[PDB]
Amino acid sequence: IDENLIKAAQAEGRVNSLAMPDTWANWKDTWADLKNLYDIEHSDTDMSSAQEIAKFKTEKKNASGDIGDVGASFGEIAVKQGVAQPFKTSYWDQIPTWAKDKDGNWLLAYTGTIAFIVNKDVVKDIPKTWQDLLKGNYKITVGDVSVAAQAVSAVLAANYALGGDEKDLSPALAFFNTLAKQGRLVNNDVSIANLEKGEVEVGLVWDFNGLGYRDKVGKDRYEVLIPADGSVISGYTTIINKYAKHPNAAKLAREFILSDKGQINLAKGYARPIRIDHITLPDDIKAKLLPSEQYKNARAIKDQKAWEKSAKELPQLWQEKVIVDMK
């Protein structure tokens, strides 16, 4: 890690993040490490992907945030909105071509697979597939599709299970319209608070969040599983605000996140680090992960551009085809 970068980051003194809370994929260990290793302070303001891009845009130079983390379908939105500045990091060549742009404005640090988190007290017949969800009477916490990458991805995951792909989300929209009409949809995100209270019945979340949240709340209260009929694998990229007040500290954070230590932190949080092939993980992680068999129909996106387009159009379709029909 370049010494002038550490020095410039320390002169700034801190890094302000958006949507990088401690409870998400063990960002906790990473912010602790920046304080403990380079004396960089930090504070975060949680939100969803779409909101992070609008905030950097709205605030300009009087930026409340320096760095954010957004879903794979939003890297290009950040770029198109002019809120991203490039920083490839010293690990650029180990990042797969499908996981980054060409200039360094966005690059996935980790990936996950859409999963179900199920309340064992309320849901007696645990759903194992997307098809199973159509027959219960319990409430499905889908995520806020208007702004969250996790929720947008959950829709694509259902779409894959219904035999579609990232070029046309119509089958999944019909599936969610069906549930909306039954009065079984909850249009908010799963959170540790709503899991603690026992309010989530079936929730749609990344496996890493399902597992992380399960530890906080109780392993015997919630089951986490990958739907057997299909799911999506996708990931997240940091975005360094073009208008960051602390650009060097943001660059330092990104560099660290991609370093062996930041990648190990992500693994301890149950996510799959993008540089998994070049790091040695601790042996204890594997046993806390889900059975491999469950991932039998989980697939990555083949056409990034088609997904970017479908995802961008999804919020309006969600309002018009799902929200408007909620019982």
Ligand X SMILES: NCCOP(=O)(O)OC[C@H](O)CO
User: Which of residues 19 and 200 has its CB atom nearest to ligand X in the complex?
Assistant: 19
Residue showing tokens 């996981």? 99
Of 148-156, 195-203, 239-247, 310-318, the window that binds ligand X (rule: CB under 6 A) is 148-156
User: Exposed, middle or buried: residue 260 (CB in 10 Å: 0-12, 13-18, 19+)?
Assistant: middle
Exposure string of 148-167, with b = 16+ CB inside 10 Å and e = fewer, is: bbbbbbbbbbbbbbbebbbe
User: DSSP labels for 258-300?
Assistant: HSHHHHHHHHHTT-EETTGGGS---TTHHHHSPPGGGGTTEEE
Crossing angle for the helix pair 247-258 and 27-38, to the nearest 10 degrees: 120
Q: Minimum CB separation from ligand X for residue 312, in Å?
A: 14
- Computed from CA positions of residues 228, 153, 268, 264, in that sequence, does the dihedral angle turn out positive or negative? positive
* Cβ-based nearer residue to ligand X, 66 or 189: 189
Q: Are 148 and 189 in contact (CB under 8 A)?
A: yes
| Given 16, 49, 113, 237, the residue binding ligand X (CB under 6 A) | 49
The answer to the question of residue 212 lying near ligand X (CB under 6 A) is no
Touching ligand X, residues 14-43 (CB under 6 A)? 19, 24
- Decide if residue 48 touches ligand X (CB under 6 A): yes
Q: How far is the CB of 48 from ligand X (least distance, A)?
A: 4
Residues 163-192 that bind ligand X (CB under 6 A): 189
Q: Is residue 111 at the binding interface for ligand X, with CB under 6 A as the rule?
A: no
Binding of residue 314 to ligand X (CB under 6 A) = no
Candidate segments 146-154, 162-170, 214-222, 285-293, binder of ligand X by CB under 6 A: 146-154
Structure tokens, 299: 């697939």
Residues at the contact surface with ligand X, assessed by CB under 6 A: 19, 24, 48-49, 69, 71, 148-150, 189
